[PDB]
């Protein structure tokens, strides 16, 4: 058995930064170390073969070095589309080929404030006995944001769930949805529904709201 | 271009057998080495096994007792069989070719995985398949609109807009597992406020595990 | 016979690489 130890686990870097990823093998594997790049929801794509061969179709800003037990993948100048998880993989074992744990590369960029939108539950959904109120934060950076739900000015807790997109491959921003889930009866007991958004790019909080039925 | 494609059931009950087939086009299985690899959600990659030639195979020891890989008589397909599955076998499964071949000899050692299949998600659960309900997220210089895709099992659903013609500014969010055991997700897009009267915006939902397809027009209320 | 020979233990011997750059990248002098 041959284990690959890949570091670091995670890194953030700016466009134009030089990035280095290291992979250490538990024993000598000569030059038989391959690197892959995996974009979210897609199969790993071969970047480097046999420690330093540059795969046809891959830009030369990627390069691999090392032999024996210590290997390195370098991006000479990071681009926004280089956001991905990178894996080393050894082909020296006669039986089990093994991968490193991965290195998630995130793109760091200037602050961008979210555009906020609120959506009331549809009438067709309400027939079915449940009300989903959706709050959208579009194209912001950085990652961290707070969404507070207020129903007739009362702060809500426990009844919302959030989802975040992966970083966008061209502009490096995130989007986020918060869904407030209420039963039909509860939803109908209140009037004002508000989403309050706090983010580093906003000097004061943005609140989007609607009145049920209008 | 040698191209690879995985196929098989998307939902497997615990203790049953997981089976998948990889179809090879533009090439033959009578040379090279044919691999299976998997990746649990949010985790890393694990090599499963390989097969070559007449049907010689070998396996990752962590799975050898439960895994068989077989090669088909058309010599265009190979197959994965995994027994006694548990929720730990929930993963995206990939097929991939490896090896270097000269005129009359194929060597595996020191080669790499290329090309790869697209990968297919397989979920091990005793919950049953259920198709989604689709609700509009109706628009209030730029407006946002979308579709709420609610209460389906298992993952995944795919969403597109205007039959694939609309992709700029589309965000389909990762699904969230609700307390009910069913998944929910939203897909949104930003459009020019001025078109909401005359341009149609339709979200195309396909939930392959349940054979449910839905096209939903989203409009101002 | 027409079937390929298959080798899983030995590295690619450079004596067979012809002018194939893939071969030359992974071979050993044996």
Helix residue spans in B61-165 (DSSP H) = none
Final residue of a structural domain among A46, A78, A108: A108
CB contact, 8 Å: C24 with chain B?
Answer: no
Rounded distance between C-alpha atoms, residue A176 and residue A172, angstroms = 14
Local structure of B179: helix, strand or coil: coil
CB distance B44–A49 less than 8 Å? no
Q: What distance in Å separates residue A35's CA from the closest CA in chain C?
A: 15
CB contact, 8 Å: A34 with chain C?
Answer: no
Local structure of B52: helix, strand or coil: strand
Question: By 3-state DSSP, what share of chain B in percent is helix, strand and coil, each rounded to 5?
Answer: 5, 50, 40
Q: Report A:75-114 residues touching C (Cβ under 8 A).
A: 94
Can you say how many angstroms the Cα of residue B64 is from the centroid of all Cα atoms in its chain? 24
Residues A150, A68, single domain; the answer is: no
Residues A150, A95, single domain; the answer is: no
CB distance C12–B107 less than 8 Å? yes
B5: buried, middle or exposed (CB in 10 Å: 19+, 13-18, 0-12)? middle
- The kind and range of the H/E element at C22 are helix C21-26
- The kind and range of the H/E element at C26 are helix C21-26
Range of A73's domain?
A: 1-108
Residues A7, A81, single domain; the answer is: yes
Judging contacts by C-beta atoms under 8 Å, the chain C residues touching residue B27 are none
User: Most B CBs within 10 Å: which of C11, C12, C16, as the mutation test of the B interface?
Assistant: C12
Rounded distance between C-alpha atoms, residue B91 and residue B175, angstroms = 16
Question: For chain A, what is the domain count?
Answer: 2
Strand partners, B106: B101, C6
Q: Is the dihedral of CA A152, A155, A160, A161 positive or negative?
A: positive
- Cβ-Cβ contacts under 8 Å between A and C: the total is 8
CB distance B113–A36 less than 8 Å? yes
Judging contacts by C-beta atoms under 8 Å, the chain A residues touching residue C9 are 94
**What's the angle, vertex CA B81, arms to CA B84 and CA B125, rounded to 5?**
45
Judging contacts by C-beta atoms under 8 Å, the chain B residues touching residue A211 are none
Q: What is the resolution of this structure in A?
A: 2.1
CB contact, 8 Å: C30 with chain B?
Answer: no
User: Most B CBs within 10 Å: which of A29, A98, A104, A136, as the mutation test of the B interface?
Assistant: A136
- Chains in contact with C via at least 3 Cβ–Cβ pairs below 8 Å: A, B
Local structure of B47: helix, strand or coil: strand
Local structure of A188: helix, strand or coil: helix
Rounded distance between C-alpha atoms, residue A75 and residue A37, angstroms = 12
Of B110, B116, B118, the CB nearest to A92: B110
How far is the CA of A195 from the CAs of A84, A146, A154, in angstroms? 32, 10, 12
Q: Is the peptide bond before A57 cis (omega within 30 degrees of 0)?
A: no
Rounded distance between C-alpha atoms, residue A196 and residue A146, angstroms = 8
Which approach determined this entry?
X-ray
**Which chain B residue is nearest to residue C2, measuring alpha carbons?**
B104
Rounded distance between C-alpha atoms, residue B180 and residue B182, angstroms = 5
Residues A92, A120, single domain; the answer is: no
Of B118, B135, B171, the CB nearest to A175: B171
How far is the CA of A209 from the CAs of A108, A149, B84, in angstroms? 32, 10, 51
Residues A54, A122, single domain; the answer is: no
Judging contacts by C-beta atoms under 8 Å, the chain B residues touching residue C7 are 105-109
Residues A26, A42, single domain; the answer is: yes
Q: What is the CATH number of the domain that holds A22?
A: 2.60.40.10
Of C4, C22, C26, the CB nearest to B104: C4
Residues A148, A207, single domain; the answer is: yes
Residues A103, A118, single domain; the answer is: no
**Which chain B residue is nearest to residue A49, measuring alpha carbons?**
B112
CB contact, 8 Å: A52 with chain B?
Answer: no
Backbone dihedral angles phi then psi of residue A41, each to the nearest 5 degrees: 75, 15
Rounded distance between C-alpha atoms, residue B95 and residue B24, angstroms = 10
Question: Structural domain boundaries of chain B?
Answer: 2-126, 127-221
Rounded distance between C-alpha atoms, residue A148 and residue A136, angstroms = 12
Q: What distance in Å separates residue A55's CA from the closest CA in chain B?
A: 10
Residues A167, A157, single domain; the answer is: yes
Residues A118, A42, single domain; the answer is: no
Residues A49, A80, single domain; the answer is: yes
Final residue of a structural domain among A73, A108, A143: A108
DSSP letter at B12 equals E
CATH of span B127-221 = 2.60.40.10
Residues A21, A69, single domain; the answer is: yes
CB distance C23–B110 less than 8 Å? no
A160: buried, middle or exposed (CB in 10 Å: 19+, 13-18, 0-12)? middle
Of B112, B133, B137, the CB nearest to A91: B112
Final residue of a structural domain among A51, A84, A108: A108
């Amino acid at each position: 058995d041959i284990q690959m130890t890949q570091s670091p686990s995670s890194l953030s870097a700016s466009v134009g930064d030089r990035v280095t990823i290291t992979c250490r093998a538990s024993q000598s594997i000569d030059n038989y170390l391959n690197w892959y790049q995996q974009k979210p929801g897609k199969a790993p794509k071969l970047l480097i073969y046999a420690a330093s061969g540059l795969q046809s179709g891959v830009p030369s800003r990627f390069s691999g070095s090392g032999s024996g037990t210590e290997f390195t993948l370098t991006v000479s100048s990071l681009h926004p589309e280089d956001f991905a998880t990178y894996y080393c993989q050894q082909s020296y074992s006669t039986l089990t080929w093994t991968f490193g744990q991965g290195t998630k590369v995130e793109i760091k960029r200037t602050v961008a404030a979210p555009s906020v939108f609120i959506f009331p539950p549809s009438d067709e959904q309400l027939k079915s006995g449940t009300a989903s109120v959706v709050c959208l934060l579009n194209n912001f950076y950085p990652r961290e944001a707070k969404v507070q739900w207020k129903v007739d000015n009362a702060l809500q807790s426990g009844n919302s769930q959030e989802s975040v997109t992966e970083q966008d491959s061209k502009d490096s921003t995130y989007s986020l949805s918060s869904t407030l889930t209420l039963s039909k009866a509860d939803y109908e007991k209140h009037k004002v529904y508000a989403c309050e958004v706090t983010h580093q790019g906003l000097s004061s909080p943005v609140t989007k709201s609607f009145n049920r039925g209008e | 271009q040698v191209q690879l494609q995985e196929s098989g059931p998307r939902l497997v009950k615990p203790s049953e057998t997981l089976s998948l087939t990889c179809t090879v086009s533009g090439g033959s299985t009578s040379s090279y080495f044919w691999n299976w690899i998997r990746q649990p959600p949010g985790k890393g990659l694990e090599w499963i096994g390989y097969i070559y030639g007449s049907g010689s195979a070998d396996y990752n020891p962590s799975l050898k007792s439960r895994v068989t890989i077989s090669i088909d008589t058309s010599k265009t397909q190979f197959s994965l069989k995994l027994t006694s599955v548990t929720a730990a076998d929930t993963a995206v499964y990939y097929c991939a070719r490896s090896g270097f071949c000269s005129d009359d000899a194929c060597y595996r050692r020191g080669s790499w995985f290329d090309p790869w299949g697209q990968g297919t998600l397989v979920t091990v659960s005793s919950a049953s398949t259920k198709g989604p309900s689709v609700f509009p997220l109706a628009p209030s210089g730029t407006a946002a609109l979308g579709c709420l895709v609610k209460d389906y099992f298992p993952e995944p659903v795919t969403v597109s807009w205007n039959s694939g013609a609309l992709t700029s500014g589309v965000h389909t969010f990762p699904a969230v597992l609700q307390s009910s055991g069913l998944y929910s997700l939203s897909s949104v897009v930003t459009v020019p406020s001025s078109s909401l009267g005359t341009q149609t915006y339709i979200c195309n939902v396909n939930h392959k595990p349940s054979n449910t397809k839905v096209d939903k027009r989203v409009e101002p209320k | 016979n027409n079937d390929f020979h298959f080798e899983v233990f030995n590295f690619v011997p450079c004596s067979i690489c012809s002018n194939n750059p893939t071969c030359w990248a992974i071979c050993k002098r044996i």
